[PDB]
Structure 1
Amino acid sequence: SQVYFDVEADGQPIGRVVFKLYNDIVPKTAENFRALCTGEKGFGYAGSPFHRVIPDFMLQGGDFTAGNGTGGKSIYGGKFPDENFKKHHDRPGLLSMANAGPNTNGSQFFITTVPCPWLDGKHVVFGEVVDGYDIVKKVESLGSPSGATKARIVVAKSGEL
């Protein structure tokens, strides 16, 4: 599956980021993300913020309940188990699940901007950027060491190709 994000910084349009999901390696993790992009469950990522952007590290988002890192939920109810760890954080431009330790996957995710081998076996990798890596770069340059954002960066519209 390929899904997309239309990103905006303080009401202003930046561009569309397109992702391919590893639906034949991590089918349940890729499905959570796909369904949250389309909003077909009546809830999902449209309108949700990138609440934590660390330059030369990653972009963290997906909290569509509270917007600050404390919320969000998966399509299976609450949190779900780590599906597997077959893919590694070996290149920039990967989608990987945020969590609160083992088997606590919900809706939060991050996008890497550098190889992160120290996250292998801790975070489930389920996709990569196939188009718009330059909008990831623009968003990244809006962050800070602390993760605080210089602008309100929102996933204004999301969907599936």
Structure 2
Amino acid sequence: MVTFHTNHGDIVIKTFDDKAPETVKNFLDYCREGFYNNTIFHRVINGFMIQGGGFEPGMKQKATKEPIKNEANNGLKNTRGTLAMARTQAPHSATAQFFINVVDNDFLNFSGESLQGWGYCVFAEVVDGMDVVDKIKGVATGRSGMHQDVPKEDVIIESVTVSEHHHHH
């Protein structure tokens, strides 16, 4: 379990380690290194998704590690509440940026191992605090430089805490 402490409240997510192992490992390495601390949700589109984890206040982009394999051929769908990795045109270009689907976004789903089929890799899902996700998706937005749908008041991930539960027979 991972908890995003945002300035709108907590978002509690469960990772899908078995179905997106490289993605989850990449995501947890960034969390534990402080990478998402003081990043913002820089692209907020109501009825679509909220996207964050790349930019500090002022649209200061952080340097990232090497990009990761797209694991979207895991069968998981971009339904409301799931997290998926943002990326550019190249299917294997994801680094740190992720988004939370706020409706079912079927058109993001993997349909084949190709430029247009690869889609977006679901690796986790919100298990608590969708109210916080729904409050964020509804904030006022505007333009910033070459970017659009930037929240007029920064929506900030202040920090991330990881929760583990270990079981012994």
TM-score, shorter chain, exceeding 0.5: yes
Deviation at 1:144, TM superposition (A): 3.9
**Matches of 2:108 and 2:157, distance apart in 1:** 25
The corresponding residue for 1:95 is 83
**Matches of 1:58 and 1:97, distance apart in 2:** 12
Query: Helix, strand or coil: the match of 2:93?
Result: coil
**Matches of 1:72 and 1:129, distance apart in 2:** 26
Deviation at 1:66, TM superposition (A): 8.2
- 2:138 paired residue among 133, 138, 141: 141
Q: Which runs of 5+ in 1 are unaligned?
A: 9-13
Any idea what the Cα deviations from partners look like across 1:7-47, whole Å, max 9, x if unmatched?
11xxxxx21110001001111101111122222xxx41011
Any idea what the Cα deviations from partners look like across 1:21-79, whole Å, max 9, x if unmatched?
1001111101111122222xxx4101101101001111000105786496552xxx311
**Matches of 1:56 and 1:69, distance apart in 2:** 26
Query: Helix, strand or coil: the match of 2:10?
Result: strand
**Matches of 1:140 and 1:69, distance apart in 2:** 21
State whether residues 55 and 144 of structure 1, in contact with CA within 8 Å, keep that contact through their aligned partners in structure 2: no
State whether residues 72 and 108 of structure 1, in contact with CA within 8 Å, keep that contact through their aligned partners in structure 2: no
The corresponding residue for 1:11 is none
**Matches of 1:29 and 1:62, distance apart in 2:** 14
Query: Helix, strand or coil: the match of 1:107?
Result: coil
The corresponding residue for 2:29 is 35
**Matches of 1:99 and 1:4, distance apart in 2:** 23
- 1:49 paired residue among 30, 40, 49: 40
**Matches of 2:50 and 2:59, distance apart in 1:** 13
Q: Which runs of 5+ in 2 are unaligned?
A: 111-118, 143-147, 164-169
Identical-pair percentage? 32
Q: Give the TM-score normalised by structure 2.
A: 0.80
Q: Give the TM-score normalised by structure 1.
A: 0.83
Corresponding pairs, count: 148
Q: Which is greater in Rg?
A: 2
